[PDB]
Amino acid sequence: PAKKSEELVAEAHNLCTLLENAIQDTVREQGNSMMNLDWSWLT
Amino acid sequence: SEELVAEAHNLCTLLENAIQDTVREQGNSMMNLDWSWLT
Amino acid sequence: ETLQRCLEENQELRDAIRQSNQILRERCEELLHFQASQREEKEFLMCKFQEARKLVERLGL
Amino acid sequence: ETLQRCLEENQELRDAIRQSNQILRERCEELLHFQASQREEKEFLMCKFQEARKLVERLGLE
């Protein structure tokens, strides 16, 4: 059954928010860098 | 509009490319290195 | 005629939206899986690099 | 009569596409930056694997 205009508009809003948050979390999580650990045991 | 419709297909193409190259470099995982000198 | 014109632009905007929605649902799913791989690689490397630290500590003695 | 419903829907649909376009723009910019961050840490950890392997090799000798 072909989706109504309303229904299409709402899925797109849903999928947009899901994409933003999926992207911002990806960007944020990796930004807890293993570069910030203590590496000084290495000398 | 259809400036809009053309702008969306292009936004989408960029998105698919960007994720493809984000999800690519992952393919060479340091899990595949020799860690046996630990053991 | 203003009706045929509108209906035709209604279908094209409805085709632009279904297609873009398909891509966003594929891209989000891909991105959710990458996030899980990233988290596992990191747990892996934090483990190795903690074992390496303890093996260094352990040798100095 | 259905022209009014058609013109209303066309408007709501164009606004849906406009908004997502905007979000797609901002989000790709972030991804491209991410790609650089991901390769900097890549090369930093590889460096540390190497140094770590060297050190361990040397202490083992003693």
Swiss-Prot record, chain B:
Localization: Cytoplasm; Nucleus; Membrane raft
Illness association: Immunodeficiency 15B: An autosomal recessive primary immunodeficiency disorder characterized by onset in infancy of life-threatening bacterial, fungal, and viral infections and failure to thrive. Laboratory studies show hypo- or agammaglobulinemia with relatively normal numbers of B and T-cells, and impaired differentiation and activation of immune cells.
Entry similarity comment: Belongs to the protein kinase superfamily. Ser/Thr protein kinase family. I-kappa-B kinase subfamily.
PTM section of the record: Phosphorylated by MAP3K7/TAK1 in response to NOD1 and NOD2 signaling, promoting activation and phosphorylation of NF-kappa-B inhibitors, leading to NF-kappa-B activation. Once activated, autophosphorylates on the C-terminal serine cluster; which decreases activity and prevents prolonged activation of the inflammatory response. Ubiquitinated. Monoubiquitination involves TRIM21 that leads to inhibition of Tax-induced NF-kappa-B signaling. According to PubMed:19675099, 'Ser-163' does not serve as a monoubiquitination site. According to PubMed:16267042, ubiquitination on 'Ser-163' modulates phosphorylation on C-terminal serine residues.
Residue list for modification Phosphoserine: 1
Protein's UniProt name: Inhibitor of nuclear factor kappa-B kinase subunit beta
Assembly information from the UniProt record: Component of the I-kappa-B-kinase (IKK) core complex consisting of CHUK, IKBKB and IKBKG; probably four alpha/CHUK-beta/IKBKB dimers are associated with four gamma/IKBKG subunits. The IKK core complex seems to associate with regulatory or adapter proteins to form a IKK-signalosome holo-complex. The IKK complex associates with TERF2IP/RAP1, leading to promote IKK-mediated phosphorylation of RELA/p65. Part of a complex composed of NCOA2, NCOA3, CHUK/IKKA, IKBKB, IKBKG and CREBBP. Part of a 70-90 kDa complex at least consisting of CHUK/IKKA, IKBKB, NFKBIA, RELA, ELP1 and MAP3K14.
Gene assigned in the entry: IKBKB
Organism whose genome encodes this protein: Homo sapiens
Record's comment describing the protein's domains: The kinase domain is located in the N-terminal region. The leucine zipper is important to allow homo- and hetero-dimerization. At the C-terminal region is located the region responsible for the interaction with NEMO/IKBKG.
Tissues with expression: Highly expressed in heart, placenta, skeletal muscle, kidney, pancreas, spleen, thymus, prostate, testis and peripheral blood.
Lineage: Eukaryota, Metazoa, Chordata, Craniata, Vertebrata
Residues of the full protein shown: 705 to 730 of 756
UniProtKB/Swiss-Prot annotation, chain D:
Post-translational modification remark: Phosphorylation at Ser-20 attenuates aminoterminal homodimerization. Neddylated by TRIM40, resulting in stabilization of NFKBIA and down-regulation of NF-kappa-B activity.
Residue numbers carrying Phosphoserine: 20, 37
Tissue/organ expression: Heart, brain, placenta, lung, liver, skeletal muscle, kidney and pancreas.
Localization per record: Cytoplasm; Nucleus
Domain of life according to the entry: Eukaryota
Residues covered by region (Interaction with CHUK/IKBKB): 1-62
Disorder noted: Ectodermal dysplasia and immunodeficiency 1: A form of ectoderma dysplasia, a heterogeneous group of disorders due to abnormal development of two or more ectodermal structures. EDAID1 is an X-linked recessive disorder characterized by absence of sweat glands, sparse scalp hair, rare conical teeth and immunological abnormalities resulting in severe infectious diseases. Severely affected individuals may also show lymphedema, osteopetrosis, and, rarely, hematologic abnormalities. The phenotype is highly variable, and may be fatal in childhood.
Free-text function comment from the UniProt entry: Regulatory subunit of the IKK core complex which phosphorylates inhibitors of NF-kappa-B thus leading to the dissociation of the inhibitor/NF-kappa-B complex and ultimately the degradation of the inhibitor. Its binding to scaffolding polyubiquitin plays a key role in IKK activation by multiple signaling receptor pathways. Can recognize and bind both 'Lys-63'-linked and linear polyubiquitin upon cell stimulation, with a much higher affinity for linear polyubiquitin. Could be implicated in NF-kappa-B-mediated protection from cytokine toxicity. Essential for viral activation of IRF3.
Complexes and interactors: Homodimer; disulfide-linked. Component of the I-kappa-B-kinase (IKK) core complex consisting of CHUK, IKBKB and IKBKG; probably four alpha/CHUK-beta/IKBKB dimers are associated with four gamma/IKBKG subunits. The IKK core complex seems to associate with regulatory or adapter proteins to form a IKK-signalosome holo-complex. The IKK complex associates with TERF2IP/RAP1, leading to promote IKK-mediated phosphorylation of RELA/p65. Part of a complex composed of NCOA2, NCOA3, CHUK/IKKA, IKBKB, IKBKG and CREBBP. Interacts with COPS3, CYLD, NALP2, TRPC4AP and PIDD1.
Swiss-Prot/TrEMBL domain comment: The leucine-zipper domain and the CCHC NOA-type zinc-fingers constitute the UBAN region and are essential for polyubiquitin binding and for the activation of IRF3.
The protein's name: NF-kappa-B essential modulator
Lineage summary: Eukaryota, Metazoa, Chordata, Craniata, Vertebrata
Shown stretch of the complete protein: 49 to 110 of 419
